[PDB]
C-alpha cells in the first residue's frame, strides 16, 4: 500500500519495484486527478481517478516489466487513512489481474 | 401439415368467418388472417396466404 | 509574454492558484507601473481577482475533458459512448399505482399527499384528492418518496398522516402494478457491460459455441469440429461441402429449448449445421429441433444438433488384499466417481474419450496408495447387449469421436484373489 493523508494537495516520493516513483494528488472540481512520473522523467499528466481501474492506461507506459497502481474505490481527499487505500502491484500479479479483468 | 390443408368437421352456418395464427410455409401470420368464409354447408377449407 | 504552454505531449498541467495569481499581478504591474497598489479594496485589485478566477476556472475546465475516448470517463459523454454500441440510461422511475381501497366516513375529502406505510416500513404517498361516497369505498392513486424499484407487499397498510375518520389502507389484486426502474446503471455496471460485450465479440466461431453451450444447466461435455472440406477429416463428414459439426452431451437435458437457444446465439452467417453420413451420433429430430423464433422482433429459424451414442464398458480387476482392510465397494465407488470426474485434475469420460486400464489403476493409486494391483483389463460394447464373454476383454478400448461411455457400480466385477 501507499501511505497518504487527508489533504487536498500532496505529493509523495517512494522507491518500489526497483524504480523511483513520485505521485501528485490534487482535487479538480469534482473528481480527483493524479500526476505520475518515474526516475525524474514525467510519465502521464492529469489522469482521472476511479475505483478499480488502473491508473496507467496506454500500452507502452504501464509495463514491459514494471508495475501499476489501482484505487479500490472512488477517491476523496477527506477519507484517506480511513477506509480508502491505494495499492501497488508489480508485474506478475498485475498481469494476473489484467487477465481477470476480461 | 406439409400441404397446409385443414378440414372443419361440422357444416358452417352462413355469414361466419374465422382466422388462423401461426407460421406456414415459413411465413409468419401472427395477426388473424382471413382464410374461410361460411357459404352455408361446406366444411372443407384451406389456409390463406401470409 | 507570460503565457505558459500547459498543454504538452504528456497531457495537461494544472498549476496552483498562487502561481496564476502572481502571474496576473506581474502582468498588471507591467501594464500600469511597478509601484501600483494591488489589494482587494481598490478596483484594480478586483480586476486582478476577476482575471485570476477566469484563467484558473477555464484552464481547469479544459483539463476536465482532456481525454474521453478511453472508457474510464463518465457522466454523459461515456453514456453516449456506450449507447453507440448498446446501453440504457435514465431508468429512474417510481411505481405509480391505481385502484386503491379506502373505507372511511361519509361525504369527506382526503387531502392530497397523505402518508402511507406498510409492514417493513416503506413510505408511500397518495397522489390526487377525492371525495368519499356514503357506501364507504373509493379508488386512490399512490406514489413513494424515493426513485426506487420498490415492491409492495400484498398486506393491509397502516396510516402515517391521518385525515379525519379515514382508515384501512387495504390491498386489492385488481390494482395495477407498474414495475419502476431505479437508476439501474450508474457508472460501473456500464464498464462491466463493455467488458461482457467485448468478451462476446472476441471469440472465434467454434470456441464461442463451446463457451455458450457449456453455460447451459445440467450439461456435462461438448464436442465440436469443422470439416472445412468435402472429405473425411476425423469422421465421415461429406454430407455437404462445408458443414459445421456439433455433438453435445448432457445429464438429461432438462430444457430442450435452451440448448437450441444457446446454439442459435452463435451462427456465422454462411454455414449450415447438418453433418454426418447416417453413421455418426443419432440426431434428436429429423427435420429440425424447433427453435424459438426470436426473443427480439424476429421470425422462425431452424438449427440442428446431435447427441452421442451411449455405451457401456466392462472392466475386470484382480487384486491382492495385502495387510489391511479395504471395502471392495469403496474401491468401486472410487472408480465410479473417477468416471464422472469429480476428482480434480482429470476431466473424466467425456465424449470422444477412450479408457484404459492404466488410467483406472492410476485413479485407484491416487485414491489409495500403499496397495498392490495385480491385473486390470477392460472392454466396452453397445448398450443393451448381454454381458460379454471373458475373451472379449482387452487392455484399452479405442472409442469413436461421436460416442460416450458410462460405468455403473454393478457393471464392474472385482476379484479379491
Amino acid at each position: 500500500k501507499i501511505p497518504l493523508t487527508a489533504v487536498p494537495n500532496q505529493a509523495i516520493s517512494f522507491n518500489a519495484g526497483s524504480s523511483y516513483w513520485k505521485i501528485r494528488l490534487y482535487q479538480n472540481m469534482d473528481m480527483m486527478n493524479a500526476d505520475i512520473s518515474r526516475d525524474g522523467v514525467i510519465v502521464c499528466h492529469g489522469v482521472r481517478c476511479f475505483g478499480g481501474i488502473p491508473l496507467l492506461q496506454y500500452s507502452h507506459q504501464y509495463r514491459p516489466d514494471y508495475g501499476n497502481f489501482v484505487f479500490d474505490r472512488d477517491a476523496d481527499w477527506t477519507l484517506f487513512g480511513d477506509g480508502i487505500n491505494l495499492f501497488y502491484l508489480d508485474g506478475a500479479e498485475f498481469a494476473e489481474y489484467q487477465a481477470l479483468a476480461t | 401439415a406439409q400441404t397446409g390443408t385443414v378440414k372443419f368437421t361440422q357444416p358452417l352456418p352462413t355469414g361466419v368467418e374465422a382466422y388462423w395464427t401461426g407460421d406456414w410455409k415459413g411465413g409468419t401470420a401472427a395477426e388473424p388472417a382471413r382464410f374461410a368464409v361460411g357459404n352455408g354447408t361446406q366444411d372443407t377449407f384451406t389456409l390463406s396466404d401470409p | 509574454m507570460a503565457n505558459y504552454n500547459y498543454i504538452v505531449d504528456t497531457g495537461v498541467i494544472v498549476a496552483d492558484t498562487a502561481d496564476v495569481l502572481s502571474d496576473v499581478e506581474a502582468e498588471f504591474r507591467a501594464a500600469l507601473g511597478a509601484n501600483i497598489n494591488l489589494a482587494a479594496s481598490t478596483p484594480q485589485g478586483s480586476l486582478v481577482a476577476a482575471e485570476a478566477i477566469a484563467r484558473s476556472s477555464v484552464m481547469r475546465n479544459e483539463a476536465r475533458i482532456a481525454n474521453t475516448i478511453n472508457p474510464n470517463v463518465s457522466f454523459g459523454t461515456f453514456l453516449d459512448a456506450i449507447c453507440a454500441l448498446m446501453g440504457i440510461e435514465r431508468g429512474s422511475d417510481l411505481s405509480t399505482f391505481g385502484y386503491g381501497v379506502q373505507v372511511t366516513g361519509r361525504s369527506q375529502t382526503r387531502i392530497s399527499t397523505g402518508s402511507r406505510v406498510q409492514t417493513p416500513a416503506g413510505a408511500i404517498f397518495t397522489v390526487m384528492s377525492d371525495v368519499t361516497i356514503p357506501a364507504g369505498g373509493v379508488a386512490t392513486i399512490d406514489i413513494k418518496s424515493q426513485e426506487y424499484g420498490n415492491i409492495p407487499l400484498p398486506v393491509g397498510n397502516l396510516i402515517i398522516i391521518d385525515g379525519t375518520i379515514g382508515w384501512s389502507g387495504a390491498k386489492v389484486i385488481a390494482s395495477t402494478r407498474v414495475d419502476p426502474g431505479s437508476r439501474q446503471m450508474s457508472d460501473a455496471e456500464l464498464k462491466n457491460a463493455r467488458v461482457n460485450r467485448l468478451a462476446i465479440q472476441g471469440r472465434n466461431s467454434t470456441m464461442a459455441i463451446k463457451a455458450y453451450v457449456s453455460a447451459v444447466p445440467n450439461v456435462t461435455s461438448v464436442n465440436v469440429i469443422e470439416n472445412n472440406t468435402g472429405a473425411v477429416q476425423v469422421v465421415n463428414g461429406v454430407s455437404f461441402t462445408l458443414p459445421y459439426a456439433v455433438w453435445v452431451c448432457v445429464a438429461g437435458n432438462p430444457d430442450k429449448q435452451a440448448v437450441a437457444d444457446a446454439l442459435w446465439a452463435a451462427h456465422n452467417g454462411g454455414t449450415p449445421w447438418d453433418y454426418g453420413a447416417t453413421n455418426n451420433g443419432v440426431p434428436v429430430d429429423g427435420p429440425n429441433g424447433v427453435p424459438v423464433r426470436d426473443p427480439a422482433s424476429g421470425r422462425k429459424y431452424v438449427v440442428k444438433w446431435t447427441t452421442p451414442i451411449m455405451y457401456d464398458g466392462y472392466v475386470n480387476v484382480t487384486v491382492q488384499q495385502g495387510s489391511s482392510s479395504v471395502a471392495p465397494e469403496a474401491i468401486q465407488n472410487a472408480v465410479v466417481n473417477y468416471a464422472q470426474g469429480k476428482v480434480e485434475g482429470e476431466e473424466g469420460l467425456v465424449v470422444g474419450a477412450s479408457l484404459s486400464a492404466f488410467e483406472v489403476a492410476g485413479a485407484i493409486a491416487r485414491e489409495i496408495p500403499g496397495i498392490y494391483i495385480k491385473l486390470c483389463q477392460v472392454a466396452c460394447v453397445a448398450a443393451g447387449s448381454p454381458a460379454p464373454a471373458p475373451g472379449d476383454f482387452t487392455s484399452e478400448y479405442v472409442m469413436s469421436a461421436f460416442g460416450q461411455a458410462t460405468i455403473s457400480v454393478g457393471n464392474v466385477r472385482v476379484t479379491f484373489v
Side-chain angles (χ1 to χ4, degrees):
Chain A
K1 66 151 51 172
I2 308 301
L4 290 165
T5 187
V7 163
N9 171 26
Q10 53 184 130
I12 192 66
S13 179
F14 60 98
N15 213 18
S18 73
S19 309
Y20 209 59
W21 300 93
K22 198 163 85 44
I23 297 169
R24 216 198 85 163
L25 271 166
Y26 68 106
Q27 184 178 2
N28 183 345
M29 309 264 287
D30 291 331
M31 302 69 65
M32 292 282 326
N33 281 334
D35 286 300
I36 315 171
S37 66
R38 182 144 47 70
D39 291 331
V41 176
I42 193 66
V43 175
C44 183
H45 273 155
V47 298
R48 269 188 278 302
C49 179
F50 276 131
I53 62 170
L55 298 195
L56 294 174
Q57 283 314 70
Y58 263 50
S59 68
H60 55 279
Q61 292 149 0
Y62 63 94
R63 86 291 182 276
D65 177 329
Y66 302 153
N68 204 356
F69 294 140
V70 176
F71 272 129
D72 46 342
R73 291 188 180 95
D74 285 17
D76 186 74
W77 77 268
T78 61
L79 277 296
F80 293 101
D82 291 331
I84 193 66
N85 284 346
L86 183 63
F87 295 95
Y88 165 58
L89 308 175
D90 67 81
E93 69 275 16
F94 174 58
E96 172 46 2
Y97 174 89
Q98 217 161 353
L100 263 59
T102 196
Chain B
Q2 295 174 350
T3 61
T5 55
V6 65
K7 159 72 154 191
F8 198 88
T9 302
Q10 274 74 24
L12 279 78
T14 63
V16 165
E17 212 283 334
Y19 301 121
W20 61 279
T21 175
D23 203 318
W24 152 248
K25 211 162 70 180
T28 61
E31 303 296 329
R34 44 180 172 85
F35 83 113
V37 175
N39 61 6
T41 56
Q42 173 54 270
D43 52 356
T44 307
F45 293 98
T46 61
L47 287 176
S48 66
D49 287 324
Chain C
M1 311 316 266
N3 170 38
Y4 278 60
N5 184 227
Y6 54 110
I7 308 168
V8 294
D9 291 331
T10 316
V12 59
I13 297 299
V14 182
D16 291 331
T17 316
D19 291 331
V20 301
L21 183 63
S22 65
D23 291 331
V24 176
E25 293 179 353
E27 291 194 13
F28 288 169
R29 252 185 269 275
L32 289 150
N35 202 356
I36 201 65
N37 190 353
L38 309 169
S41 61
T42 182
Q44 54 253 19
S46 85
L47 301 163
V48 192
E51 173 68 26
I53 297 169
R55 197 169 298 183
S56 66
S57 158
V58 67
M59 160 187 156
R60 286 181 176 261
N61 171 346
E62 311 210 323
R64 183 159 151 284
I65 319 169
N67 46 2
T68 304
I69 73 165
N70 197 306
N72 54 359
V73 310
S74 71
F75 303 145
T77 61
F78 181 76
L79 277 296
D80 193 350
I82 184 61
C83 187
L85 187 153
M86 182 295 308
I88 308 314
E89 195 51 21
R90 191 46 190 210
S92 180
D93 203 348
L94 183 62
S95 69
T96 57
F97 292 166
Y99 302 95
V101 176
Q102 271 309 89
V103 70
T104 67
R106 81 292 183 276
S107 192
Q108 78 170 358
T109 300
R110 204 101 171 191
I111 315 168
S112 299
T113 74
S115 284
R116 297 291 185 269
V117 69
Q118 57 92 31
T119 48
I124 302 100
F125 293 100
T126 197
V127 179
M128 294 298 102
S129 56
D130 60 356
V131 309
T132 301
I133 61 172
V138 296
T140 67
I141 305 166
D142 291 331
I143 203 170
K144 277 73 69 177
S145 296
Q146 46 269 44
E147 294 278 349
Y148 289 163
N150 198 334
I151 179 167
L153 294 174
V155 176
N157 290 318
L158 172 143
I159 301 298
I160 288 305
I161 282 177
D162 47 351
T164 300
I165 201 67
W167 291 352
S168 166
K171 54 182 311 313
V172 65
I173 62 170
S175 177
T176 55
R177 170 71 174 90
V178 192
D179 202 45
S182 176
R183 275 311 301 119
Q184 291 305 126
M185 81 296 278
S186 63
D187 264 0
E189 55 274 18
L190 281 73
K191 325 278 191 177
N192 284 357
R194 284 271 301 181
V195 176
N196 298 317
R197 295 297 299 165
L198 277 296
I200 291 294
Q201 299 318 106
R203 289 160 269 212
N204 275 354
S205 80
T206 61
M207 212 60 100
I209 297 169
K210 178 200 297 156
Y212 292 165
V213 176
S214 314
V216 307
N218 280 122
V219 71
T220 298
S221 171
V222 167
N223 179 17
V224 174
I225 193 66
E226 161 190 356
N227 55 290
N228 210 359
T229 50
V232 175
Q233 69 302 326
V234 286
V235 292
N236 47 359
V238 182
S239 55
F240 292 165
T241 174
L242 317 167
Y244 280 165
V246 188
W247 292 271
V248 298
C249 189
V250 74
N253 188 207
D255 291 331
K256 174 272 301 173
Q257 78 282 17
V259 300
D261 291 331
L263 264 170
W264 181 64
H267 186 273
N268 293 112
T271 57
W273 297 120
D274 210 327
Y275 200 81
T278 62
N279 295 113
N280 310 59
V282 292
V284 159
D285 213 18
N288 182 23
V290 55
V292 191
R293 54 221 61 191
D294 180 10
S297 294
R299 314 165 322 289
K300 193 72 221 73
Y301 290 165
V302 307
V303 73
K304 295 181 182 292
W305 82 88
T306 181
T307 53
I309 298 171
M310 291 315 118
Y311 264 80
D312 74 277
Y314 294 69
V315 57
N316 273 354
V317 62
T318 62
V319 63
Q320 278 291 345
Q321 293 84 246
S323 309
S324 170
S325 297
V326 174
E329 59 188 1
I331 297 169
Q332 296 195 163
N333 290 318
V335 186
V336 174
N337 69 46
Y338 181 76
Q340 188 274 331
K342 65 178 72 66
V343 60
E344 52 205 80
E346 277 291 346
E347 313 193 323
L349 277 296
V350 311
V351 298
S354 294
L355 73 165
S356 176
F358 299 153
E359 321 295 349
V360 183
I364 297 169
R366 304 301 201 181
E367 196 265 333
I368 186 65
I371 207 62
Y372 173 70
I373 297 169
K374 196 265 172 186
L375 182 63
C376 183
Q377 65 182 177
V378 76
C380 194
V381 65
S385 195
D392 293 332
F393 276 91
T394 178
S395 87
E396 181 295 339
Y397 168 81
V398 187
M399 181 205 267
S400 176
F402 63 91
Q404 180 69 94
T406 309
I407 301 299
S408 76
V409 181
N411 189 359
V412 57
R413 54 221 301 191
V414 306
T415 52
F416 271 46
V417 182

